Every structure is written in C-alpha cells, then in structure tokens.
Design an enzyme around this catalytic site. Sequence first.
Site, short mmCIF file in Angstrom:
data_model
loop_
_atom_site.label_atom_id
_atom_site.label_comp_id
_atom_site.label_asym_id
_atom_site.label_seq_id
_atom_site.Cartn_x
_atom_site.Cartn_y
_atom_site.Cartn_z
N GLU A 132 0.82 -1.21 0.00
CA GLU A 132 0.00 0.00 0.00
C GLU A 132 0.86 1.27 0.00
O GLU A 132 0.41 2.36 0.39
CB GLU A 132 -0.98 -0.02 1.18
CG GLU A 132 -1.80 -1.35 1.23
CD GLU A 132 -3.23 -1.21 1.76
OE1 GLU A 132 -3.52 -0.20 2.42
OE2 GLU A 132 -4.04 -2.14 1.54
C1 LIG Z 1 -4.88 -0.58 7.75
N1 LIG Z 1 -5.68 -1.27 6.70
C2 LIG Z 1 -5.06 -2.22 5.88
O1 LIG Z 1 -3.85 -2.44 6.09
C3 LIG Z 1 -5.81 -2.89 4.88
N2 LIG Z 1 -5.49 -3.83 3.96
C4 LIG Z 1 -6.60 -4.11 3.26
CL1 LIG Z 1 -6.74 -5.13 2.12
N3 LIG Z 1 -7.61 -3.37 3.69
C5 LIG Z 1 -7.16 -2.60 4.70
N4 LIG Z 1 -7.80 -1.63 5.49
C6 LIG Z 1 -9.25 -1.31 5.29
C7 LIG Z 1 -7.07 -0.96 6.50
O2 LIG Z 1 -7.61 -0.12 7.22
#
Ligand SMILES: Cn1c(=O)c2[nH]c(Cl)nc2n(C)c1=O
Length: 285
Positions: A132
């Site tokens: 990310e």
């Molecule tokens: C911190 N965070 C993540 O690391 C993550 N990976 C994925 Cl796939 N969705 C999410 N959300 C919604 C998060 O808030």
Amino acid sequence: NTNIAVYWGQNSAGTQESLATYCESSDADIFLLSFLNQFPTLGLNFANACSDTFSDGLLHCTQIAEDIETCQSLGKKVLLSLGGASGSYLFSDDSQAETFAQTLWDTFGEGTGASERPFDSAVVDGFDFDIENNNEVGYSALATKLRTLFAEGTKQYYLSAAPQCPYPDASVGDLLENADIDFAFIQFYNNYCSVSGQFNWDTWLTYAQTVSPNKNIKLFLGLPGSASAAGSGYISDTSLLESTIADIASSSSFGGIALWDASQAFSNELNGEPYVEILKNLLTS
Ligand SMILES: Cn1c(=O)c2[nH]c(Cl)nc2n(C)c1=O
C-alpha cells in the site's frame, strides 16, 4: 469454488479473538495474517494477538502457530500477508527481493535454512501482497522466485495480492501483470470504484481474461466487514449484495468475497446474524 477470505491480526474492531476461533466458524475459508509489516529486515505485527519475541525482537507467536495448524486441520488456508497501510517496507531491486523469497521460504515455509521461525513448526499456505506504499519494485520477481521454491514443499501454496479497485494498482499492478497469482482480493472501498460508486469489476475481469499471466486467477469482491471498518464502501443492502454477486458470479474468474477484517465481519450483526455469515450464505446460493 466460492470462498470467503478474511484478514485477521490488526484487530480492527477491538474485540479480535484468536485465529482459531474464526477458523472454527463455518463462515470463512481463507485467512490472511496481518501483517509482516516490515521487510527485508523481518518485522511482524498482530496487534494484541502476539507479544513475545526472540532475543533480537522478531515476534515469536506460539498461539498463532498452534492456531495455524488447527485452522489447517479444519480445511482452511492461512496466508501470511505482507505490507499493510503503514508499516516499514521496500525493495530497492529485483535481486534484493529474490534473496527475500528464500528468507520467506526458510522463515515461514518449508525451507530448511535454520532461521528464527515466528510460528515454530507451523507452515503457512502462502503469501498475500497487501502493498500500500505505491512502490512496485521487486514483488513480481519475489513471487516468481517463491514459485520455484514451492516445488520443494509438500503441499500446494498460494500467492495473492490486495489491490485497491482503481486499475492499474500503483503498488501491486506490476505483480498482477508479471507474476502467477492465485487470488486477487480487490478492495472495493475507500475509492470511487466501490459497489455503490462507479463499480469497475468489468475492468478486473478484462485483467483476469487478457492480462493476468495466470488465466484462472480468481477475483474476489473485497469489502469492509462493518461500516467503520473503512471510511467508505461498506454495503448494508442485502439486495445490492445479492444483485452484485449475481452479476459477478457468472464467470469462472469469480472467487468469492474478501473482508477487512475478521474482528469486524464476525461481530457486525444485521438483525443478529453476523455479516460474514450473511455473505457466506449469499455465496452458496
Ligand atoms: C490498515 N488497513 C489495511 O492495512 C488494509 N489492507 C486491506 Cl486489504 N484493507 C485494509 N484496510 C481497510 C485498513 O484499514
């Protein structure tokens, strides 16, 4: 088939239970351990679910290790998810990431090099790439090198990626285009392209059919487990859920639903039925 995947580890809802607790539900099939948040220099974070460490500070997690094995006896798949929103990770190049494949194999898989094993003799069923940070370097080379190593193992291993819905993804786009990936857990939330927005499943389907080096890659409808699992994109309308699933289950490329995260989806009720249960049931029909 059609599976439910759940992220587990970051305790999104506060009330996160043991990995094995969720595996002992009928409600989820794939479990994504969140996260190896620091690499190449190894670092794990499972919120409140693991706090012991080796002397060097790498997490050492006996309860999760036992739970991985319990989950696997019950037929569940458990992948270690790399990255995360936030965290501390980056590859400078392909060679660095290729070295790292061996590190992962020896640390988490059936590799024989005697590294410190956060999960003792438990072996993961593979890796999720939840990159990310908008840096794509190395993941494709890492996935390809992992595949060569998997042949040394004694079971099938899986690789997945967690793109957000905008296509192409700025972190795992290269991975998805240049490596053999089993599952794409596409995040249809926090973005214009959610189900209730300008839903772009069709683009992902083109990707699966024409672009994915693995033509039977399975695309997953990735969703928040509760309003407040994400800022936006959570779906409380069971009709919209039904129609969405009906639209997308038509193809061989449809794999199921992914949820952020277990704590959320299992505790969020729609008139007393857990959200994850509602969705598992919508899939079976
Ligand atoms: C911190 N965070 C993540 O690391 C993550 N990976 C994925 Cl796939 N969705 C999410 N959300 C919604 C998060 O808030």
